[PDB]
Amino acid sequence: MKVAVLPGDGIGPEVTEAALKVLRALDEAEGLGLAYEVFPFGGAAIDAFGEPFPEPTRKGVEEAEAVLLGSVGGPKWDGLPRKISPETGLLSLRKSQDLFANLRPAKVFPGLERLSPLKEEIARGVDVLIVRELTGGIYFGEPRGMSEAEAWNTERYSKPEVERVARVAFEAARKRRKHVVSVDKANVLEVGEFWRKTVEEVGRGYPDVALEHQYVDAAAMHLVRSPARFDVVVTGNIFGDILSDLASVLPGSLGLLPSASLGRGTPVFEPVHGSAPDIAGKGIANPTAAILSAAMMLEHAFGLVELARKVEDAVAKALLETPPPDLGGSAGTEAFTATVLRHLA
Amino acid sequence: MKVAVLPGDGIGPEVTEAALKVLRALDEAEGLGLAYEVFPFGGAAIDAFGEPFPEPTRKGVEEAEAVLLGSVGGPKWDGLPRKISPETGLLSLRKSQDLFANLRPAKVFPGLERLSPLKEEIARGVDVLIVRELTGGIYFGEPRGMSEAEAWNTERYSKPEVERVARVAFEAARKRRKHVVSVDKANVLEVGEFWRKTVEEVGRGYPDVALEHQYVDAAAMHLVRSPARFDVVVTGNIFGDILSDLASVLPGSLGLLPSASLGRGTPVFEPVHGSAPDIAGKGIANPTAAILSAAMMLEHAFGLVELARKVEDAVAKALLETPPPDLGGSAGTEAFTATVLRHLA
If you write DSSP's letter for every residue of B317-340 in order, what string do you get? HHHHHS--GGGT----HHHHHHHH
Q: With the C-alpha atoms ordered B180, B183, B184, B185, is the resulting torsion angle positive or negative?
A: positive
CA distance B185 to A137: 14
Tell me the chain B residues in contact with residue A224 when contact means C-beta distances shorter than 8 Å: 117-118, 224, 246, 249-250
Instruction: Indicate the pairing of strand B232-235 with strand B127-133.
Output: parallel
Is the Cβ pair A151, B191 closer than 8 Å?
Answer: yes
Is the Cβ pair A139, B216 closer than 8 Å?
Answer: no
Q: Which residues contact A324 (CB under 8 A, 6 or more apart)?
A: A284, A286, A287, A288, A331, A332, A336
Nearest to B345 by CA among B319, B323, B321, B313: B313
Check CB contact of B191 with chain A, cutoff 8 Å: yes
Q: Are A216 and A239 in contact (CB under 8 A)?
A: yes
Nearest to B34 by CA among B266, B258, B304, B259: B304
Query: For the domain that residue A197 is a member of, what is the CATH number?
Result: 3.40.718.10
CA distance B8 to B31: 28
Check CB contact of A193 with chain B, cutoff 8 Å: yes
Instruction: Scan residues 249-268 of B and list those with Cβ closer than 8 Å to A.
Output: 249-250
CA distance A254 to A246: 11
Is the Cβ pair B158, A145 closer than 8 Å?
Answer: no
Domains in chain A: how many in total? Answer: 1
Output Rg (C-alpha) for chain A, integer angstroms.
Answer: 20
Which residue among A144, A190, A249 places its CB closest to the CB of B146?
A: A190
Q: How far is A280 from chain B (nearest CA, A)?
A: 27
Give the number of beta-carbon pairs within 8 Å between A and B. Answer: 144
Instruction: Scan residues 93-112 of B and list those with Cβ closer than 8 Å to A.
Output: none
Is the Cβ pair A217, B150 closer than 8 Å?
Answer: no
Tell me the chain B residues in contact with residue A159 when contact means C-beta distances shorter than 8 Å: 148-150
If you measure CA to CA, which chain B residue comes closest to A139?
B188
Is the Cβ pair B117, A122 closer than 8 Å?
Answer: yes
Q: What share of chain A is helix, strand, coil (3-state, %, to 5)?
A: 50, 20, 30
Annotated binding site of B for substrate: 94, 104, 132, 217
Which residue among B148, B155, B224 places its CB closest to the CB of A155?
A: B155
Neighbours of A47 (CB within 10 A): 12
Q: What angle do CA A40, A43, A44 make, to 5 degrees?
A: 45
Q: Which residues contact A83 (CB under 8 A, 6 or more apart)?
A: none
Q: How far is B238 from chain A (nearest CA, A)?
A: 9
Catalytic positions of B:
139, 185, 217, 241, 245
Annotated binding site of B for NAD(+): 74-87, 274-286
CA distance B137 to B101: 13
Tell me the chain A residues in contact with residue B134 when contact means C-beta distances shorter than 8 Å: none
Cα distances from B127 to residues A189, B228, B251, in angstroms, run: 31, 6, 9
Check CB contact of B118 with chain A, cutoff 8 Å: yes
Helix/strand/coil for A345 = coil
Q: Are B117 and B250 in contact (CB under 8 A)?
A: yes
Is the Cβ pair B138, A189 closer than 8 Å?
Answer: yes
Cα distances from A279 to residues A69, A282, A332, in angstroms, run: 18, 6, 11
CA B133 to chain centre: 13
Instruction: Indicate the pairing of strand B99-107 with strand A99-107.
Output: unpaired
Annotated binding site of B: 74-87, 94, 104, 132, 217, 241, 245, 274-286
Is the Cβ pair A224, B242 closer than 8 Å?
Answer: no
CA distance B133 to B162: 8
Nearest to A107 by CA among A311, A285, A303: A311
Cα distances from A74 to residues A10, A14, A49, A256, A276, in angstroms, run: 7, 16, 17, 20, 8
Annotated binding site of A for NAD(+): 74-87, 274-286
Tell me the chain A residues in contact with residue B154 when contact means C-beta distances shorter than 8 Å: 143, 152-155
Nearest to B216 by CA among B190, B183, B249, B181: B183
Is residue A178 left, alpha or beta, with left meaning phi > 0 and alpha meaning psi from -120 to 50? Answer: left
Is the Cβ pair B159, A152 closer than 8 Å?
Answer: no
Nearest to A96 by CA among A60, A130, A149: A60
The distance between the two most distant Cα atoms of chain A, rounded to a whole number of Å, is 66
The one-letter code for the residue type at B326 is D
Tell me the chain B residues in contact with residue A246 when contact means C-beta distances shorter than 8 Å: 217, 220-221, 224, 246
Is the Cβ pair A152, B149 closer than 8 Å?
Answer: no
Catalytic positions of A:
139, 185, 217, 241, 245
Method used to determine the 3D structure: X-ray
Cα distances from A76 to residues A46, A73, A93, A277, B160, in angstroms, run: 11, 8, 21, 10, 43
The distance between the two most distant Cα atoms of chain B, rounded to a whole number of Å, is 66
Q: Where in the sequence is the domain holding A340, given as residue range(s)?
A: 1-345
Is the Cβ pair B220, A138 closer than 8 Å?
Answer: no
CA B267 to chain centre: 11
Check CB contact of A144 with chain B, cutoff 8 Å: yes
Is the Cβ pair A116, B117 closer than 8 Å?
Answer: no
Check CB contact of A34 with chain B, cutoff 8 Å: no
String of DSSP letters for A87-125? HHHHHHHHHHTTEEEEEEEEE--TT-GGGSSB-HHHHTT
Residues facing B166 on adjacent strands: none
If you measure CA to CA, which chain A residue comes closest to B137?
A152
Is the Cβ pair A153, B154 closer than 8 Å?
Answer: yes
Which residue among A148, A194, A217 places its CB closest to the CB of B242?
A: A217
CA distance B122 to A248: 17
Q: How far is B138 from chain A (nearest CA, A)?
A: 8
Annotated binding site of A for Mg(2+): 217, 241, 245
Q: Are B271 and B289 in contact (CB under 8 A)?
A: yes
Tell me the chain A residues in contact with residue B144 when contact means C-beta distances shorter than 8 Å: 189-190
CA distance A301 to B126: 43
